[PDB]
TrEMBL record, chain B:
CDD domains: UDP_G4E_1_SDR_e. This is UDP-glucose 4-epimerase. InterPro entries: NAD(P)-bd_dom, NAD(P)-bd_dom_sf, UDP_G4E. Pfam families: GDP_Man_Dehyd (PF16363). The lineage of its organism: Eukaryota, Viridiplantae, Streptophyta, Embryophyta, Tracheophyta. UDP-N-acetyl-alpha-D-glucosamine binds at F181, N182, N202, L203, T219, Y221, R234, R298, D301. Its EC number is 5.1.3.-. It comes from Zea mays.
Length: 336, 344
């Protein structure tokens, strides 16, 4: 069984490719290497051992229709997992056309080529950013949707495109996965991430930054700092194995489904700092600051739908995430 | 010399706007792929424009053809772009959503990128009152909540949001989004007008085909709404008034650029008219009788929608000059002189 993984050289994608190879899939990755190194997939192939030969890599942009058509014509794909996209919020505010072009034109082209080739099974990387600034927690998949920056708008637009495609053509089977806050690295520390709290904390721990600025101390949370659902990247990867299994075993009873991928636990900024201090043995000097414009106060997942319908629950906790980030970053201070 | 690039200018609203522009002395470059129009509308525009027809140049190009679009922008100095190009059939958008997302979003994104790279950051965009969805009150002001109820409507709202994000990223952009209400009618000469393919999806093109004998009756979709007669109520605006609202938008960009960023204005009349009232007005204009069939509501239809005109009146200095009687007169003149459209 062969899976096309767009964006598979990136953070979540590379961890997912490793698990797919262990599960016995043939994997074809398409990635333009805009935001990733080819070394990530070389290392994934090493970690895959006996299954490393089942990984094929093509340096292709999804907007290159001809190149994409040739990839689909050379393989019979069971499904596509679509991680490719740009994701930096600040860059999206400064360069919105870059984001709308890359994310929307790349996705639309992929969907068209998929339909023309008869591959109508998709798993899409969405994000909890589509819940906006939620009025209540935990956030269920039925919550009101609204994006708060151009990057988030691209994710919500793509979800809506997928729902419209499914309504137009019931042969499509689509799973949208709303990831919460990814942290960590494979526990080998040989692959990992190469703009967010925990990467900043780790840089403070090694002295590359003098302090962590804490954005907001007057929130209505236990310690006054912002609260998020931090989820180990290996758990996120595993949720994609569950999504392929759902498409493989339960396609007759799904259409365009959406599931949160989170832990269901909210952890504050200071709690994550404390967990990282314990993992690293380092102190993280703090500067307390005002709220950061655009920040939600508290966001975490309602896990019930994923637990019952996707048959998936996260397995790793925040201390483990912090240890695995520390291990990767200590062994690889400059990434790959 | 002032030159305007008009995308989608071979279509219904675009052709009427091209004509008004030519009559004001603008040079007009039209980009249109002719997917939903023929050259005939533009050739009649050029005929009505007299010697000013020499000031209309037509480029048969798709907005997604980046190389061809770059060639146009690099060889012209444009004061502004008016962007009418797009697909607009609701039912087709539900059945073929990728066609709509591709044409409308990829075309618009390509256009904005080519504009920005070639130093033309002045845009007037064809939006729609569809973004108000099912309004909780009327009249609808520009600050009402925005939604989309079908894939076509989603493309319009997404493009409005792209434009707002582009402006926020780069204050040299000046963008006017125009939310059209329900366009009806034709230039009073009767030489140009709406020429739909197939069975018309909208009320007044359907009515006129009944009046000229090509279809046997109008089906009325829904008679149980909470309105005066039970049928849907809309703000019908003469297409020539819509065209004049674009002249007003260009004037605002030309004279008031500093005070604006990415602004939005309704283009409507502020009056709601029901389906039955439009049929009666068309019977009076045409002298024909329109037989009716009664049916249930059409999925997705709003009950009552009409414009709050105060912002356009104050800030664009624009108000509609035509009423329902004139819209119906002008539609009938186009229909009876061209019962089979441009093809004859
Ligand atoms: N969070 C969301 O989840 C997904 C994965 O997140 P992540 O943390 O792994 O991000 P990431 O940046 O590590 O992974 C995204 C990958 O997609 C690739 N990519 C971007 N645009 C592409 C295009 N047009 N064609 C082909 N490849 C392209 C990038 O090079 C990168 O390797 C993203 O969609 C992100 O928005
Ligand atoms: N009249 C309405 O029902 C109505 C009301 C509100 C808003 N609008 C919007 O107003 C605009 C004009 O309306 P209209 O009645 O003149 O529609 P129309 O279909 O007559 O005009 C659209 C024109 O755009 C052209 N076009 C489409 N895709 C193109 C592309 N990629 N490149 C170049 N040209 C392309 C078509 O060939 C057509 O001539 C449209 O964008 C429409 O969505 C429609
Ligand atoms: O230097 C920092 C960075 C973050 N925070 C706080 O830490 C928490 C997490 O922040 P961050 O890592 O920026 O994540 P989010 O605010 O949840 O959102 C970012 O991270 C998400 C997960 O990767 C993405 O989906 C979003 O698009 C992206 O804006 C927030 O409460 C922040 O206020 C700080 O106090 N100091
Ligand atoms: O054969 C018909 C067609 C329409 N109607 C009724 O007539 C009214 C107007 O319908 P229509 O002409 O189809 O316009 P709307 O659906 O209001 O849509 C128009 O008004 C919106 C506001 O801009 C635009 O988005 C649309 O593209 C534009 O075509 C509605 O109450 C319809 O139920 C009928 O009874 N029979």
């Amino acid at each position: 069984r062969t899976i096309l993984v767009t964006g598979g050289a990136g953070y979540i994608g590379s961890h997912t490719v490793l698990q797919l190879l262990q599960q016995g899939f043939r994997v074809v990755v398409v990635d333009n290497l805009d935001n990733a190194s080819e070394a990530a997939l070389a290392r994934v192939a090493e970690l895959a051992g006996h299954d490393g030969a089942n990984l094929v890599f093509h340096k292709v942009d999804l907007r290159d229709r001809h190149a994409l058509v040739d990839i689909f014509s050379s393989h019979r794909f069971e499904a596509v997992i679509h991680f490719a996209g740009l994701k930096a919020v600040g860059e999206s505010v400064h360069k919105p056309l870059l984001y709308y072009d890359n994310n929307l034109v790349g996705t639309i082209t992929l969907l068209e080529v998929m339909a023309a080739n008869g591959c109508k099974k998709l798993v899409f990387s969405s994000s909890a950013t589509v819940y906006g600034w939620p009025k209540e927690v935990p956030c269920t998949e039925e919550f009101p949707l609204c994006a708060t920056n151009p990057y988030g708008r691209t994710k919500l637009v793509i979800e809506d495109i997928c729902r419209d495609v499914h309504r137009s053509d019931p042969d499509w089977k689509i799973i949208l996965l709303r990831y919460f806050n990814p942290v960590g690295a494979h526990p080998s520390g040989y692959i990992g991430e190469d703009n967010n709290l925990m990467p900043y904390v780790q840089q403070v721990a090694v002295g590359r930054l003098p302090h962590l600025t804490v954005y907001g101390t007057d929130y209505s949370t236990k310690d006054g700092t912002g609260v998020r659902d931090y989820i180990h990247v290996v758990d996120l990867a595993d949720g994609h194995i569950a999504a392929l299994r759902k498409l493989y075993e339960d396609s007759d009873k799904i259409g365009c489904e959406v599931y949160n991928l989170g832990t269901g636990k909210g952890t504050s900024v200071l709690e994550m700092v404390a967990a990282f201090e314990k993992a690293s043995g380092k102190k993280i000097p703090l500067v307390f600051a005002g709220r950061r414009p655009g920040d939600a106060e508290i966001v975490y997942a309602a896990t019930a739908k994923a637990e019952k319908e996707l048959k998936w629950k996260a397995k790793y906790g925040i201390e483990e995430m912090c240890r695995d980030l520390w291990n990767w970053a200590s062994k690889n201070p400059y990434g790959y």
